[PDB]
Coordinates of C-alpha atoms in Angstrom, one line a residue:
X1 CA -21.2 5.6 16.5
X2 CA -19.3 4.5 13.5
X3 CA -18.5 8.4 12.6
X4 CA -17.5 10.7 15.7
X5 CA -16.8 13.9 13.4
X6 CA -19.9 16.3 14.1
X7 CA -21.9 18.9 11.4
X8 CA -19.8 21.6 12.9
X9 CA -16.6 21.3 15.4
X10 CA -13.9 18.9 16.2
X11 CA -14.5 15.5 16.9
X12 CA -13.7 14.3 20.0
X13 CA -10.2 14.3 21.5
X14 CA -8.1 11.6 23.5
X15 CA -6.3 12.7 26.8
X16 CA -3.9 9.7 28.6
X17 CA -5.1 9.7 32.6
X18 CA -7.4 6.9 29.0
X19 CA -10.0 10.3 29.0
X20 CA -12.2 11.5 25.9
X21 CA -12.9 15.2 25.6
X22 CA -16.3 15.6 23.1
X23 CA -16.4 18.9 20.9
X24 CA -12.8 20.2 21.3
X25 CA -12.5 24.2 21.2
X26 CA -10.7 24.7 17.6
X27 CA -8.6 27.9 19.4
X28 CA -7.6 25.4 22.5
X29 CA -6.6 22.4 19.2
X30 CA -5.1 25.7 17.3
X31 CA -2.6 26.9 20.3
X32 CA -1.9 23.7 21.6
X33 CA -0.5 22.9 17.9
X34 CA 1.8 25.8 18.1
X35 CA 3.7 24.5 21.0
X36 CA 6.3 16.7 20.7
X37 CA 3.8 14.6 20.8
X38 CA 0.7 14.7 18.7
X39 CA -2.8 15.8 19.3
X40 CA -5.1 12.3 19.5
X41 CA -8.6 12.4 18.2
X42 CA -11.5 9.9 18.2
X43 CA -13.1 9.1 14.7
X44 CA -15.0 6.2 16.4
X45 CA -14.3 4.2 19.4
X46 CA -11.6 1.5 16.9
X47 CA -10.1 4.6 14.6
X48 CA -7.7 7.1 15.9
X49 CA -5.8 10.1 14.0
X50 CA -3.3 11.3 15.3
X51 CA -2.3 15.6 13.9
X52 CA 1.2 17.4 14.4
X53 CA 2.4 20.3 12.7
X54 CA 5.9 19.6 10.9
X55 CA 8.6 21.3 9.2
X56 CA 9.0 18.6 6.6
X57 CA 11.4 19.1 3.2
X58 CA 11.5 22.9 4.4
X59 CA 7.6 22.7 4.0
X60 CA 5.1 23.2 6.8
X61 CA 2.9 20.6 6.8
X62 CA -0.1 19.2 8.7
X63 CA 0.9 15.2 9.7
X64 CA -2.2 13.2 9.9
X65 CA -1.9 9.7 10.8
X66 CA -4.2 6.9 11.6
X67 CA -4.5 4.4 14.2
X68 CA -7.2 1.3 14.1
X69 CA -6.9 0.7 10.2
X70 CA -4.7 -2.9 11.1
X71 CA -7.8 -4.2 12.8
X72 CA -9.7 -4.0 9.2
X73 CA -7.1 -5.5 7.2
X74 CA -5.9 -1.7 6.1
X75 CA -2.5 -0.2 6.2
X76 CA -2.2 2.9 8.2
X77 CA -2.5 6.2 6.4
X78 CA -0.3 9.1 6.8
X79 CA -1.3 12.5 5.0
X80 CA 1.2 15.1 5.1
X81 CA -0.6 18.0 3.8
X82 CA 1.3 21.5 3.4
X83 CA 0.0 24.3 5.2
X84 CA -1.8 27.5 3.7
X85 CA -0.7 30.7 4.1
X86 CA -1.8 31.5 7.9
X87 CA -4.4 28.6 7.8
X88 CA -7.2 29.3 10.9
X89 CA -9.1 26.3 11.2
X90 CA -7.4 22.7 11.1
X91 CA -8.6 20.4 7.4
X92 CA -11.5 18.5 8.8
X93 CA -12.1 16.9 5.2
X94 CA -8.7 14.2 6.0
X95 CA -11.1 13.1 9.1
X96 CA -14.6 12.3 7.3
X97 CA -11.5 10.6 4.9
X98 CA -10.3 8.1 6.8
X99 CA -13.8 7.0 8.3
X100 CA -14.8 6.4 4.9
X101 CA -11.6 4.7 4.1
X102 CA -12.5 2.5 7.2
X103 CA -15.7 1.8 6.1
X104 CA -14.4 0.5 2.9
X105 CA -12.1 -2.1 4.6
X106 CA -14.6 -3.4 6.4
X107 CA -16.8 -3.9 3.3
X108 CA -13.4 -5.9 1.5
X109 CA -12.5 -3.2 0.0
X110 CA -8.8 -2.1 1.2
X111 CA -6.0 0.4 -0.5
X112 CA -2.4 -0.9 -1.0
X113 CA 0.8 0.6 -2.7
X114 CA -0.2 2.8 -5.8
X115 CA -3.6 1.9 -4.8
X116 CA -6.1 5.4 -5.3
X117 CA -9.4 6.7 -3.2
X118 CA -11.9 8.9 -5.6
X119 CA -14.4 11.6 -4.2
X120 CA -17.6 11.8 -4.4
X121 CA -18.3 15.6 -3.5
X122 CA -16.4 18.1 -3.2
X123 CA -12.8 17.7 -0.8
X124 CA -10.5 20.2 0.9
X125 CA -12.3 23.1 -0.9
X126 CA -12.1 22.3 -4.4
X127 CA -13.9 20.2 -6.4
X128 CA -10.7 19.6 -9.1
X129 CA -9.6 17.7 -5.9
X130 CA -10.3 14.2 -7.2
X131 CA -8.7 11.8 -5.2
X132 CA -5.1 10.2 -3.0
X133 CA -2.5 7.9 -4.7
X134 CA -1.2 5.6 -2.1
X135 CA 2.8 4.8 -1.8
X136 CA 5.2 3.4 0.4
X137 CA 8.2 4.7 1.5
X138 CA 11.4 3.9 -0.4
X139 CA 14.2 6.9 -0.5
X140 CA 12.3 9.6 0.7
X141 CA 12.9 10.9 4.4
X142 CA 11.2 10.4 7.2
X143 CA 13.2 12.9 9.9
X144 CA 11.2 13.5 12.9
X145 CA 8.2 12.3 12.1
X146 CA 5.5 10.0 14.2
X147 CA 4.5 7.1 12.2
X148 CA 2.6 4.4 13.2
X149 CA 3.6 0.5 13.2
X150 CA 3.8 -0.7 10.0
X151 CA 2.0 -0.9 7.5
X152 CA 1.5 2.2 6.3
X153 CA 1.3 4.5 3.2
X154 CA 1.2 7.8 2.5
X155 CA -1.8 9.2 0.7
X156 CA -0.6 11.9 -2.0
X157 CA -3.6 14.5 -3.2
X158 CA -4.1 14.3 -6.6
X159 CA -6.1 16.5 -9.3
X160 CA -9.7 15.6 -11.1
X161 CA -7.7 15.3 -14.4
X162 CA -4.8 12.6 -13.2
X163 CA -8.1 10.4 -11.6
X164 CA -7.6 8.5 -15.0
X165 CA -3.7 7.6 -14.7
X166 CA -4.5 6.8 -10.8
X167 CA -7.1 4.2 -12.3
X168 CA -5.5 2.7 -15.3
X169 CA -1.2 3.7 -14.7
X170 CA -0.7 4.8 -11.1
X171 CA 3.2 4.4 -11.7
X172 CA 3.5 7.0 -14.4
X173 CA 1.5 9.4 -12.1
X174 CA 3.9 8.8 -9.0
X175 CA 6.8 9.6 -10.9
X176 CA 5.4 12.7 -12.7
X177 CA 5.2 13.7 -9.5
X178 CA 9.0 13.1 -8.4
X179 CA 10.2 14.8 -11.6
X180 CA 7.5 18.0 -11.0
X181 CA 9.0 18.4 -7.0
X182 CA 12.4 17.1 -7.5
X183 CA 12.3 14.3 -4.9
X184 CA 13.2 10.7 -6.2
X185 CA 10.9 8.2 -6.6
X186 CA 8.1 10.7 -5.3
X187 CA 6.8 13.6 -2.6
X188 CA 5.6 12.0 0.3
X189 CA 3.8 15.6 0.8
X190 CA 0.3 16.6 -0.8
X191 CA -0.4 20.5 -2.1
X192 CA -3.7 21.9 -2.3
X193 CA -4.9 24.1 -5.6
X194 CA -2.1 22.7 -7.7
X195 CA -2.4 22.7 -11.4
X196 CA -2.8 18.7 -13.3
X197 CA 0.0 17.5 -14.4
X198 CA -2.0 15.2 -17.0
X199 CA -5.0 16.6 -19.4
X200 CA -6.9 14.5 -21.6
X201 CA -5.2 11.1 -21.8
X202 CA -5.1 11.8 -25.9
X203 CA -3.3 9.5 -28.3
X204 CA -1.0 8.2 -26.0
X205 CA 0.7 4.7 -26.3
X206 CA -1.3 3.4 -23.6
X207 CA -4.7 3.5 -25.4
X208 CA -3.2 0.2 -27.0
X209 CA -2.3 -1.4 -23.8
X210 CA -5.5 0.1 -21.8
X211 CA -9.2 1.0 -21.4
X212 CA -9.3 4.8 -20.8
X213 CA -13.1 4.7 -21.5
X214 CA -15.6 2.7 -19.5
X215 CA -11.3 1.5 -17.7
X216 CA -12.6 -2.3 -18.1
X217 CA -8.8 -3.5 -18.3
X218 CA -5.3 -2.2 -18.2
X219 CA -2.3 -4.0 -18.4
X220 CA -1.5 -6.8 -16.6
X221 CA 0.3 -6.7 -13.5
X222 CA 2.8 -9.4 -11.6
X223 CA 3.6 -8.3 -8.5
X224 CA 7.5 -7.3 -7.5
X225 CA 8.0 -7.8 -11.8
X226 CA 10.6 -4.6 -12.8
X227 CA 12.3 -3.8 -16.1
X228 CA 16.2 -2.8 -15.9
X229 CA 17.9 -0.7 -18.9
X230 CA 21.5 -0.5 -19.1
X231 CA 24.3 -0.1 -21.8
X232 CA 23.3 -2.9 -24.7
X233 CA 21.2 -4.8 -21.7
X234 CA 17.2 -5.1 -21.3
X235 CA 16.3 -7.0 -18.5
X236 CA 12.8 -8.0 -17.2
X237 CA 13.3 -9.9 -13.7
X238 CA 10.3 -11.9 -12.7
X239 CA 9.9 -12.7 -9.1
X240 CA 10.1 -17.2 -8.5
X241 CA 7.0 -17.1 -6.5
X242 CA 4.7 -15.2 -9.3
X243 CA 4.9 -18.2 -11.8
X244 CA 1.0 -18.3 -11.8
X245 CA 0.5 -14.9 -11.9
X246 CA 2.6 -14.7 -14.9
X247 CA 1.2 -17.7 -16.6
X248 CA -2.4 -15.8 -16.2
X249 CA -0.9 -13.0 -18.0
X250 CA 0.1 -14.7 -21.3
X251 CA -2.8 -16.6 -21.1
X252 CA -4.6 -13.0 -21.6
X253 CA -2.4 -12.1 -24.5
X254 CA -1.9 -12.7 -28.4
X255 CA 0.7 -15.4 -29.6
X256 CA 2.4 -12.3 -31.4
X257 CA 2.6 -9.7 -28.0
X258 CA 3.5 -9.9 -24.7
X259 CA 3.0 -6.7 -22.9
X260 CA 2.9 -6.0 -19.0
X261 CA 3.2 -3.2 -16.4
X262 CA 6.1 -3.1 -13.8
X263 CA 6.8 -2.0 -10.5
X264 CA 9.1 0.4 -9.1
X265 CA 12.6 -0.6 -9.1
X266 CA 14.3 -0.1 -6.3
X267 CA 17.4 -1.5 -7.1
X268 CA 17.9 1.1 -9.8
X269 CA 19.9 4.7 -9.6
X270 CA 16.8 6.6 -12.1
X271 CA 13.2 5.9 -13.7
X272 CA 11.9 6.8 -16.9
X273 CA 9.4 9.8 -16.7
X274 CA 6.3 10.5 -19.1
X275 CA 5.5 14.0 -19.3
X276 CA 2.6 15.4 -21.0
X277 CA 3.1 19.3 -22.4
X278 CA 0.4 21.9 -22.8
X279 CA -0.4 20.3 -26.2
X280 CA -1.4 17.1 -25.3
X281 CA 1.4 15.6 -26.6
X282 CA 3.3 13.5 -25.1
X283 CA 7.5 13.3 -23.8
X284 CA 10.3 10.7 -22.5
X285 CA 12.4 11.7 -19.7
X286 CA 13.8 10.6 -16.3
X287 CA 14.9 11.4 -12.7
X288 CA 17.6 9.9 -10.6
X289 CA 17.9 9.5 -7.2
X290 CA 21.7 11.5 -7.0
X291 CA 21.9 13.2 -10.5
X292 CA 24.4 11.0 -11.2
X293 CA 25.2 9.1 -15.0
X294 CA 22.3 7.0 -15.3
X295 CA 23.7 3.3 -15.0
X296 CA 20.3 0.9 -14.3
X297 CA 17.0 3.2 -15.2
X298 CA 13.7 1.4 -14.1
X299 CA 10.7 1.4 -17.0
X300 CA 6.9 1.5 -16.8
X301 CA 6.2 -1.3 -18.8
X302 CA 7.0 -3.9 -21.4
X303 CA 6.0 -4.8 -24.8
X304 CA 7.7 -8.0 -27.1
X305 CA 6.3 -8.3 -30.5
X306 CA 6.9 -11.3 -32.2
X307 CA 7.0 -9.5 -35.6
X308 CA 10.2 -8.3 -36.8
X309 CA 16.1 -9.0 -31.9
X310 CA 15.2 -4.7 -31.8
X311 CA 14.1 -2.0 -29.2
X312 CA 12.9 1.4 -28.3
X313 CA 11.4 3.2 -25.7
X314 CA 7.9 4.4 -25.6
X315 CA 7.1 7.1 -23.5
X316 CA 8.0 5.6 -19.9
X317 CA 8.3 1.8 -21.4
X318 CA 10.3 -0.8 -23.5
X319 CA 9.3 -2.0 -26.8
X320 CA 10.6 -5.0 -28.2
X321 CA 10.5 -6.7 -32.0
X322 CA 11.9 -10.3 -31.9
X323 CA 11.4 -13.2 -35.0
X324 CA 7.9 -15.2 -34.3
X325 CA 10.6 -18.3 -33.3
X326 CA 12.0 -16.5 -30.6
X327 CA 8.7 -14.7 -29.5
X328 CA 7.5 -19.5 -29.4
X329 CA 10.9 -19.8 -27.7
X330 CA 10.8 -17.2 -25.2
X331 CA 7.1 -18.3 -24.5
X332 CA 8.4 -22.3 -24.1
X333 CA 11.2 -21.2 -21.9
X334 CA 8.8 -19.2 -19.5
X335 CA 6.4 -21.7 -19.3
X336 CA 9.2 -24.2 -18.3
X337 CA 10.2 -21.1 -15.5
X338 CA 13.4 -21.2 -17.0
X339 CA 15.7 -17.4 -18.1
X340 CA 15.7 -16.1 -21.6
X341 CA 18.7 -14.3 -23.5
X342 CA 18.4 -13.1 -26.9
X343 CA 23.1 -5.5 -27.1
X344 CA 21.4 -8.4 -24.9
X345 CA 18.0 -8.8 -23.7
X346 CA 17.1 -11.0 -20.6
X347 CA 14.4 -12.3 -19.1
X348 CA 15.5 -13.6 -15.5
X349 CA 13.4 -15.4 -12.3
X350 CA 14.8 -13.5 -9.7
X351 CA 14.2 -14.0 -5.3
X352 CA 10.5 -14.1 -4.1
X353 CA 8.5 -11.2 -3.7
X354 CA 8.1 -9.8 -0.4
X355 CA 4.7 -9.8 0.5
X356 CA 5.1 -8.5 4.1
X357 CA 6.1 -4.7 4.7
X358 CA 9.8 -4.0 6.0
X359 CA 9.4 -4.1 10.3
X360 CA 6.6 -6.5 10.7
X361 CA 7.0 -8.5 13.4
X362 CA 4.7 -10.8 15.2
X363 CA 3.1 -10.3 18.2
X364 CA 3.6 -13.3 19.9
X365 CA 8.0 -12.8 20.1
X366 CA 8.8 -9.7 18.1
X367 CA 10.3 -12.3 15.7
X368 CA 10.4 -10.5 12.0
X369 CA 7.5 -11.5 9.1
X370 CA 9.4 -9.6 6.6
X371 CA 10.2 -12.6 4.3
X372 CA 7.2 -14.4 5.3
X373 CA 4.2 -15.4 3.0
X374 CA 0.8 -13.1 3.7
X375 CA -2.6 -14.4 3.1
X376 CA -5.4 -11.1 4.0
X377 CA -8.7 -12.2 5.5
X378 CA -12.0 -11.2 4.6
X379 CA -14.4 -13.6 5.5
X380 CA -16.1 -12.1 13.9
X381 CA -17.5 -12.9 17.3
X382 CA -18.9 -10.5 19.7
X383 CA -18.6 -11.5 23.4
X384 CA -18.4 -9.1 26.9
X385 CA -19.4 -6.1 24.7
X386 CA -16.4 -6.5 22.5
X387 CA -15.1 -8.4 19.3
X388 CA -12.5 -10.9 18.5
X389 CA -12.1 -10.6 14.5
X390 CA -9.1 -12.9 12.3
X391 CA -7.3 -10.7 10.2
X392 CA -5.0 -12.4 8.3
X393 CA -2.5 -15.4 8.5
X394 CA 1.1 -16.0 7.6
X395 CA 2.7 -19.1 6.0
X396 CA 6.2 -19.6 7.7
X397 CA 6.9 -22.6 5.1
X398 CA -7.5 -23.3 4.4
X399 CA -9.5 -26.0 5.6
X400 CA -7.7 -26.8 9.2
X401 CA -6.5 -22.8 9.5
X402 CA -10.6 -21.4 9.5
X403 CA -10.8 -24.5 12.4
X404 CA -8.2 -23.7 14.3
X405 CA -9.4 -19.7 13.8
X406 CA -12.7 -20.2 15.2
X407 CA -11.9 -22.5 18.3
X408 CA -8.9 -19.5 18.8
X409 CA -11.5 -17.0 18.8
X410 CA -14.2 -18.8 21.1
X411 CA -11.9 -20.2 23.6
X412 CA -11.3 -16.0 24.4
X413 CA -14.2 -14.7 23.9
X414 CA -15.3 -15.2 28.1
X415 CA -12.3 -13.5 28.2
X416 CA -12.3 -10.4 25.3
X417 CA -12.9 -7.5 28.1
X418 CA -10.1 -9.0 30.6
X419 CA -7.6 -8.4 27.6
X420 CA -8.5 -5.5 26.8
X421 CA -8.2 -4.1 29.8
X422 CA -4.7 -5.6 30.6
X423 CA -3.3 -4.4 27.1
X424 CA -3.5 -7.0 24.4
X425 CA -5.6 -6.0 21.8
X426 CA -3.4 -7.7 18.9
X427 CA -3.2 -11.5 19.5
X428 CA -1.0 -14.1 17.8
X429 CA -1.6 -17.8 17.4
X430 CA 1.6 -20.0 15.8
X431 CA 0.8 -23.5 15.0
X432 CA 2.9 -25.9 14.3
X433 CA 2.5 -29.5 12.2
X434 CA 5.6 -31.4 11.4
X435 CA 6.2 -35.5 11.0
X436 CA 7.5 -35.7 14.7
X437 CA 6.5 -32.7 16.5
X438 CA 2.8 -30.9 16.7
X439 CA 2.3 -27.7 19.1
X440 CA 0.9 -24.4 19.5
X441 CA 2.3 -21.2 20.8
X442 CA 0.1 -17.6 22.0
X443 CA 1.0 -14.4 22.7
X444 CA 0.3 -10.4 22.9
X445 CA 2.7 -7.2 23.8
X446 CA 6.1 -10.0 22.7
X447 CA 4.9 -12.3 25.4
X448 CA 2.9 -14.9 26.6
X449 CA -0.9 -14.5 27.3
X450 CA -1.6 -15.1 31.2
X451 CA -1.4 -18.9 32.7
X452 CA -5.4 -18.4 33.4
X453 CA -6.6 -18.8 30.0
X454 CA -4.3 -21.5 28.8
X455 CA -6.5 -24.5 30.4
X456 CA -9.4 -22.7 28.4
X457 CA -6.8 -22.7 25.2
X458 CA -5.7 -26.0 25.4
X459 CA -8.8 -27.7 25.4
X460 CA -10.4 -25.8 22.2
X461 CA -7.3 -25.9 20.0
X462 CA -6.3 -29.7 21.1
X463 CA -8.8 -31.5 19.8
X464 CA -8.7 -29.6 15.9
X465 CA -4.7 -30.0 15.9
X466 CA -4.4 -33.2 17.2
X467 CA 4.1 -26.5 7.9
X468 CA 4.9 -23.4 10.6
X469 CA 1.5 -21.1 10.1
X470 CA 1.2 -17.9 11.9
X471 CA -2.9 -16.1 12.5
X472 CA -3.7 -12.6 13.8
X473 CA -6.6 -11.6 15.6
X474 CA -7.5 -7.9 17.1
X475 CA -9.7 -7.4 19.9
X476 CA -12.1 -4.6 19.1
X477 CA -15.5 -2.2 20.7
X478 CA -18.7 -3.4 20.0
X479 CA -20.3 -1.0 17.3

């Protein structure tokens, strides 16, 4: 029910009349492989994956994709996993994957850029397979490949001995892995049998910043927060709408350090690199995204000790030793959200960050959510053998928003098998609340939702609504 994939065989596959053929013949799967569009198999009844073989970055690869993980609160995955020297059967292990990766979702538990998954047996045949990094796409290409809507990240295999890096650094880890392939930030690819490109973490700088044993904490992380180097210039640029999350961070630190991690920078031309040689110990280097003269290199992370302005790189990071009255002064001015200068060293609030993926758009118009606020929901009603479940709501710019959620959600549900049927399984509600004006607006497919259920809409929502705010809802089989 909730797992398709038998003991032995395929599970089953999708044929558009839309048909379901149950224990596919793996020659029939094999041939029809070797000859557009990709192959569409049934995990369960709400999660697809879809399996195409593609030539990608002169590589043969095996493109799984997924289809259903939206519904859950989950990006889409997309595994691109490099074929084996005249490889028979087709990887089953990416399948019994992504089911448990659904399963996790709908427990709360979802994976997000640099996010990790961990196994619990063995995977793919080897049991030094020990887990996926998650990424987004940035400069790597996507040439002829079939993605689904976004979002969606790709899940890159990685080794039993990086599983700590994953857990505690995931940045340093993607990036080892650009500089190892070549490819700038990172592959987009995974290889099978590889040898780890980390060992025993060791007496790496980290350990101070860290848990590697028991990993209770690492360092603390504000989203969209990068650190630019450049000739006699150190910048860290905080995003204007993570105030809070940066107050919580220095809150959790000493009066004499302030240490954090960053994110990739994308707005730089290379990234430092941490590579660990067959020692243990440990090296700084860097890749670039033309092999051109380094002019703005992104860092791992941050350190400012109020001790000694001076600096240094450590390993992938900055290290910084500034006078304990600059180290009260620099605190004051960020508590204040105001920039910091002390070569030159800056601390800048820079444009919001983007919670939405790049080409969101909302069901309702097709109008674009990319620099709109996103609020994930994890808190359903079953009707007509199906299910109506709110997914997550945007803030165009709690209490009314569950109200207006539930009455939503009932006024449809006489009606859940009637959309389904007629193709609108995502559903959009916009509400808006302003000093003159107060309406509502529906939708599916970029249009409205048929005249016949508006009477039914109207005199739910009404009554609860008599600030822009944007709700999602996907129409799902009863499991």
């Amino acid at each position: 029910a909730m797992n398709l994939i038998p003991e032995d065989g395929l599970p089953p596959i999708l044929i558009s009349t839309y048909a379901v053929e149950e224990k596919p013949s793996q020659i029939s799967v094999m041939q029809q492989l070797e000859d557009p569009d990709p192959l569409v198999f049934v995990l369960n009844a709400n999660l697809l994956s879809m399996v195409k073989i593609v030539n990608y970055v002169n590589r043969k690869c095996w493109c799984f994709t997924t289809k259903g993980m939206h519904a859950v609160g989950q990006s889409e995955i997309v595994i691109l996993l490099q074929c084996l020297p005249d490889e028979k059967c087709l990887p089953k292990d990416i399948f019994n994957h992504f089911v448990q990766l659904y399963r996790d979702a709908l427990a709360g538990n979802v994976v997000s850029n640099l996010g990790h998954s961990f196994f619990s047996q063995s995977f793919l045949g080897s049991k030094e397979h020990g887990g996926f990094l998650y990424v987004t796409s940035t400069y790597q290409s996507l040439q002829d490949l079939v993605l689904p809507t976004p979002p969606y990240l790709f899940g890159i295999l990685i080794q039993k001995w990086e599983t700590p890096w994953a857990k505690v650094f995931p940045i340093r880890l993607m990036l080892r892995l650009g500089a190892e392939y070549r490819l700038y930030p990172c592959p987009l690819f995974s290889v099978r049998f590889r040898k780890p490109l980390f060992g025993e973490t060791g007496h790496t700088i980290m350990n101070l910043l860290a848990d590697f044993r028991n990993y209770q904490y690492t360092l603390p992380v504000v989203q969209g927060l990068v650190v630019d180097m450049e000739v006699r210039k150190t910048s860290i640029k905080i995003p204007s709408n993570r105030y809070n999350e940066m107050m919580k961070a220095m809150n959790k630190s000493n009066e004499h350090v302030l240490a954090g991690g960053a994110c990739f920078n994308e707005k730089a031309d290379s990234h430092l690199v941490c590579v660990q040689n067959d020692d243990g110990n440990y090296q700084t280097q860097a890749i670039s995204i033309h092999n051109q003269p380094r002019k703005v290199t992104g860092a791992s992370f941050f350190v400012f000790s109020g001790a000694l302005a001076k600096s240094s790189i450590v390993e992938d990071g900055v290290m910084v030793q500034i006078t304990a009255e600059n180290m009260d002064s620099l605190r004051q001015a960020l508590r204040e959200m105001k920039d910091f200068t002390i070569e030159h060293i800056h601390i800048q609030w820079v444009d919001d960050d983007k919670n939405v993926s790049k080409g969101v758009v909302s069901p309702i118009d097709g109008k674009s959510m990319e620099t709109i606020t996103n609020v994930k929901i994890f808190h359903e009603y079953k009707a007509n053998g199906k299910v109506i479940r709110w997914t997550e709501v945007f803030f165009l710019e709690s209490r009314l928003t569950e109200h207006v959620a539930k009455a939503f959600c009932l006024a449809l549900c006489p009606h859940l098998k009637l959309l389904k049927e007629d193709g609108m399984t995502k559903l959009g509600l916009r509400v808006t609340l302003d000093s003159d004006q107060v309406g509502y607006q529906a939708g599916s497919n970029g249009q409205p939702l048929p005249s016949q259920y508006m009477n039914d809409l109207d005199s739910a929502l009404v009554p609860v609504i008599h600030v822009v705010m944007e709700l999602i809802f996907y129409i799902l089989e009863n499991i």
